[PDB]
Amino acid sequence: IQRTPKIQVYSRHPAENGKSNFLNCYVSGFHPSDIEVDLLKNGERIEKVEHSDLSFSKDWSFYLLYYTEFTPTEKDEYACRVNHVTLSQPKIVKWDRDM
Amino acid sequence: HKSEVAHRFKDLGEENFKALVLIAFAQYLQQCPFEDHVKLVNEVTEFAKTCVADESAENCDKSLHTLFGDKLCTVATLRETYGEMADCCAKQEPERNECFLQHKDDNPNLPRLVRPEVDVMCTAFHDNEETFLKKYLYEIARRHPYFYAPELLFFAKRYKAAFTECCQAADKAACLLPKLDELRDEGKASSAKQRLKCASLQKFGERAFKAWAVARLSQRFPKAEFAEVSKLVTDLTKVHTECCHGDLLECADDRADLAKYICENQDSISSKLKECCEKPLLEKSHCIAEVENDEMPADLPSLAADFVESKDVCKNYAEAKDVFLGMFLYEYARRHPDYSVVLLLRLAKTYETTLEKCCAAADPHECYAKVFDEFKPLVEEPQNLIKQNCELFEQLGEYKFQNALLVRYTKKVPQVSTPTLVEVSRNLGKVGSKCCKHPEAKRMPCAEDYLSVVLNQLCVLHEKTPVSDRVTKCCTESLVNRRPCFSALEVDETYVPKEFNAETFTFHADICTLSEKERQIKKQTALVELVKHKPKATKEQLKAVMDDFAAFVEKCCKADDKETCFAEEGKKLVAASQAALGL
């Protein structure tokens, strides 16, 4: 009846500085379907962000993949920012390099 | 007669009966295995024999539709193996048969017939012959549920003739495959002409078909009087109405009687019928359907006499619209065997529009004196189109031609699915092979006849699964103006273009197994898809991006570790393509 999102951020391939990759953000397990997801480079939103069809799982909860092409550098910091009916205020998830 | 089953069986004879019934079931139940149909046919036959015996016996009073119905609902599974067909067993006659008729060829797309090897066929033929021929009837009937039952019987005699004439040869393939391949080609054209005949009747009305028939017969029998061409048009209408509604037994009979009427009255119809009328039941009707036009009369007055100069034009038009206009097609038709029937009907249409408006005018004669001017553009436009299209077909391949059409139709009608587009082009494209051979005079009519059949195929299927408004409109507005409607259509600016992404050109390395025939269909697919990404794309850009594509495929199949390439270059071909298109 009202579920809060689960936010994972991960690169498509293992991160290597200077080599081209994709950064994914995977918002999942939420209800209802309205959700705002923005990818952040160094705090500010990227505009070449593509995203998959809004879909749902066995348990009826919705899910969604936002993703961008990018070449990580050592200095650069990325993050995913999600708003949804069930969240006090935008939640921002930082891209852990390892996961 | 109390029993219709009895009547037909008597008239048609047993062997034709069993065939027509087997066709009947094949056409309705297209996936029921062969053996089953034979049981059903044999059941229905044996029932009939008991009414040829006693016409008042249990159930012989029933109509053919009730009996063939009752029997088709024997297989109740229907839903699991056919779909919305089962919904029909719910209903009662006559709504029931209308249902069964709507639900033929929802699925054209049934497995292809891989021909067995010529020797295995000649085995089977020499062995159980009687069956081998039934399997032909069944296999053809079920892929062409509107195939003209009586002609199919004749094709079945030709099939048998080919094997009778060729299985005694050392090189059987050299002898036979040519004959079977012509017989297949005649067949596919016949099925198509007949599907237009039934669409005409069902979806457009008796009026529309009669107009066609009058135009058509008048070309072939230019010395017959209008009074005679009508009686024939009426007879032909009954016959076709009947095999289009599935009454195969009745329509075969009636066709027989028509051939018999034609021969008995040869003198008032055509001098070219002498040879034909001396043949056996089945080849009589084919001959007469296929024979040469009679030579046209001596000193026919100008078409202006009756239709523009006469002071009775509006009188007659007011008194008998459909008769008068029939006279028009008859008089025009007999003067012009060269023109296509489609074209003559368009001309009659303009004539009628004109009279409609002009008889309402202050001075009607003044208004329509120059009606024949209006026909000049209706004749030129088709000649110009076929002329351009035959130049294009020489100057480019059969292949490169299809691509030209595929891009053309995808821009008009991008809402249609990629595989449907590829196919419709391949068939339109076949108008190069078929018609540009013929000489000047004869090209446009060949073209228009063939195109009008190909498009009707598209329309009959589109109506059951609508996806483009533009197709619906062209298909619906006028039967006789389909071709020019489609030609008139510009780039569809309503369409919201597909967008690109990294994954747009995603291929696993299974594409290098592919034959050439196979890999060309794939190119044609990528072509359609590029247009759907930007419909206003010019020929220049399109070939650019398409060369890039073929560069890609050649490159990646020629690498160690294939899937590194696809994975890595798959996005670069996308990047490439956006540049080469604008975005």
Binding site: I1, Q2, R3, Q8, Y10, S11, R12, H13, P14, F22, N24, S28, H31, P32, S33, D34, E50, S52, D53, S55, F56, K58, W60, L65, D96, D98, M99 | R79, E80, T81, Y82, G83, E84, A86, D87, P108, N109, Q415, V416, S417, T418, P419, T420, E423, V424, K464, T465, P466, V467, K498, A502, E503, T504, T506, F507, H508, D510, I521, K522, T525
Partner: protein
Amino acid sequence: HLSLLYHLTAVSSPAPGTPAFWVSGWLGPQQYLSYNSLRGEAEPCGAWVWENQVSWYWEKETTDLRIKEKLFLEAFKALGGKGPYTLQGLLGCELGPDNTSVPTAKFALNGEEFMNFDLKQGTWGGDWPEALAISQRWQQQDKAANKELTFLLFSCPHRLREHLERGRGNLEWKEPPSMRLKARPSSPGFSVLTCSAFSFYPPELQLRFLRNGLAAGTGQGDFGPNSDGSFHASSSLTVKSGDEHHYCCIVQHAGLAQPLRVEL
């Protein structure tokens, strides 16, 4: 063993420019189809654009999903009351032993299962008042029951067979994961080990931790999709600082001839 499943969704008041209704079609875990109320047309997704497919297949899909659109948007009339709604349906079929299909037809209102379609009686069912309302509106219609029967007992399994033949290439695809195991100082005398699997298909995959050859269980697992139909996974474990180089991580997956021991 795989299955064709449609993910129908309708909402009672959509963010403007958003669709009222939309469908995603799946073969196993791959999305082959995509549809919505704005565009009005069923389209192939991903590698399924390149499927060796027959004419009219797609516009048959479109035709069917439009009937579904009408039905779903009708449901909200039946419900009446205020609070926004979300109606979901999971419809499909899976192949069984004897050249046999097994169908599915369940629905959820505002995220809770509430309604279903009994293929024996040809009727929708469920006993919440909301489900009785919708169930009734659908049952008395342009033979909606019959079309749902044909869609599940006839169309769906005929499609599923066709995709298996003409799309082995995609379905039998195998891509083994790139693996990385890394150590991440966390707490006082603690540290987090994170084993990560990148770009693999199919999505079945296990991660396990060993500590000098003996199981340390698993900790938190996490799993997701990449843009291209492939998948991503990671599993994480708390661990005494300085004791890190004693642990390794083992990974099972259809695309690997044998399980892979992954060092730090």
